Amino acid sequence: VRTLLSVLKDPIAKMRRLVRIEQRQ
Amino acid sequence: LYKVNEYVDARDTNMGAWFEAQVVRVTRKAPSRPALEEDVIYHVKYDDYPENGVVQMNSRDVRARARTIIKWQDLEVGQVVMLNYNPDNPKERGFWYDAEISRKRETRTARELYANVVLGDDSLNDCRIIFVDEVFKIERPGEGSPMVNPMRRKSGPSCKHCKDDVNRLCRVCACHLCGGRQDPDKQLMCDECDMAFHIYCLDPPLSSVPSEDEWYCPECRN
Ligand SMILES: [Zn+2]
Ligand SMILES: [Zn+2]
Ligand SMILES: [Zn+2]
Ligand SMILES: [Zn+2]
């Protein structure tokens, strides 16, 4: 299952996460 | 050739983007074809992607760290420069690309810049560039002076709250419970809210990372 390490490697996915997090509600 | 410890840029061949890096070792491999120069391989660490670790890079994907900004008024069409762009959201900040300036214009509302932006595949033509004051002169081989005073750049994926500072805890970036950045391999990623959790910070904890498809956090009903 997905890990933070796998995200932190992928610069796109890293960025895409942040947005999903910040603009959620 | 670029020295050990020299701050440099490194090009991610998958996406074309350039990244702040630091030279860890230089390996000089002998040529395959006659009258060809020796092949310099640079082993490099990323300033803000240490998780990647030390990576082997070809001398074409490495050039002296970008130091000089060209001013709005000084930019002319046809010029090849490094500038910021986000292929996911052009209004928002993204990554650092090489681009050829195509159109320059000054309306009553705001100053407009357009350039052909080189990505992993190919160009992207006449893109609307918004960070118009952060246009970097590309440091040409030969000219310059080793950067052993880092000229950092504001990059796209930063955390608003911890500024990606590794000496701060953060329950957004990192583990949602302790806010710790250690053992990121043992930090499960909620497949709903995209929050991170140490296996040991879970209650009850886990001893290792689950081998199932999806994983949800408690809040997300798991
Ligand atoms: Zn926030
Ligand atoms: Zn943070
Ligand atoms: Zn934790
Ligand atoms: Zn969740």
Side-chain angles (χ1 to χ4, degrees):
Chain A
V1 68
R2 190 168 53 130
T3 63
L4 173 60
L5 179 62
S6 49
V7 172
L8 293 179
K9 275 176 302 189
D10 182 3
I12 297 284
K14 189 188 220 292
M15 184 165 67
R16 294 259 264 277
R17 191 199 169 206
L18 285 174
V19 168
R20 282 189 300 261
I21 284 168
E22 295 282 359
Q23 284 79 240
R24 194 193 174 191
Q25 74 191 15
Chain B
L1 60 91
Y2 304 137
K3 308 297 167 183
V4 179
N5 289 294
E6 184 168 5
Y7 297 98
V8 298
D9 289 308
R11 188 176 56 198
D12 185 312
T13 60
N14 297 168
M15 47 185 304
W18 286 91
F19 293 93
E20 298 166 350
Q22 190 160 356
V23 175
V24 169
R25 210 190 326 126
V26 173
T27 297
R28 294 165 191 175
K29 211 167 58 60
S32 49
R33 315 200 183 195
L36 198 75
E37 174 70 79
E38 290 202 2
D39 299 60
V40 176
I41 308 164
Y42 288 105
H43 305 234
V44 206
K45 187 194 89 302
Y46 290 99
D47 296 2
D48 47 356
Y49 294 82
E51 306 88 5
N52 281 249
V54 169
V55 193
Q56 277 194 10
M57 305 276 305
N58 190 25
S59 54
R60 64 163 61 110
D61 295 310
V62 179
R63 59 181 172 64
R65 176 72 71 76
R67 48 203 70 188
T68 296
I69 280 175
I70 304 165
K71 183 65 210 305
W72 163 254
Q73 68 206 355
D74 299 312
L75 295 166
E76 275 173 343
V77 168
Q79 213 175 6
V80 183
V81 289
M82 188 176 76
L83 43 72
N84 184 281
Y85 184 71
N86 189 358
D88 290 340
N89 194 352
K91 300 187 167 187
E92 298 310 305
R93 167 174 260 114
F95 304 95
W96 291 97
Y97 290 112
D98 295 5
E100 182 199 359
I101 290 171
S102 59
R103 286 164 47 227
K104 185 182 169 189
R105 179 198 186 190
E106 181 154 357
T107 60
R108 290 269 70 69
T109 50
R111 305 169 296 170
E112 297 182 5
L113 191 67
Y114 302 85
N116 311 312
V117 161
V118 178
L119 295 181
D121 50 297
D122 208 65
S123 284
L124 223 75
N125 279 245
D126 205 47
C127 287
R128 177 65 187 278
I129 303 303
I130 274 159
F131 305 97
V132 298
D133 301 302
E134 304 173 50
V135 183
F136 278 70
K137 188 228 166 209
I138 290 162
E139 285 296 294
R140 296 305 190 190
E143 296 149 344
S145 172
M147 175 78 71
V148 294
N149 46 351
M151 176 63 172
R152 294 176 303 188
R153 292 189 295 286
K154 208 85 182 70
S155 201
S158 60
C159 175
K160 319 180 65 162
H161 302 319
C162 64
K163 311 301 191 294
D164 282 327
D165 190 18
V166 303
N167 280 67
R168 307 178 161 194
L169 292 167
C170 182
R171 295 169 167 75
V172 183
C173 292
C175 174
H176 191 49
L177 304 180
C178 75
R181 309 176 182 292
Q182 80 295 344
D183 295 305
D185 48 299
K186 304 211 165 196
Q187 286 185 55
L188 308 190
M189 275 279 301
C190 187
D191 281 301
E192 177 55 67
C193 69
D194 294 8
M195 286 278 81
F197 294 91
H198 283 131
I199 58 179
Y200 37 78
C201 291
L202 289 166
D203 184 51
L206 303 92
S207 49
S208 65
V209 174
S211 297
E212 274 179 351
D213 293 11
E214 304 83 354
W215 181 84
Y216 301 79
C217 76
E219 297 93 75
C220 301
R221 193 171 175 294
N222 191 342

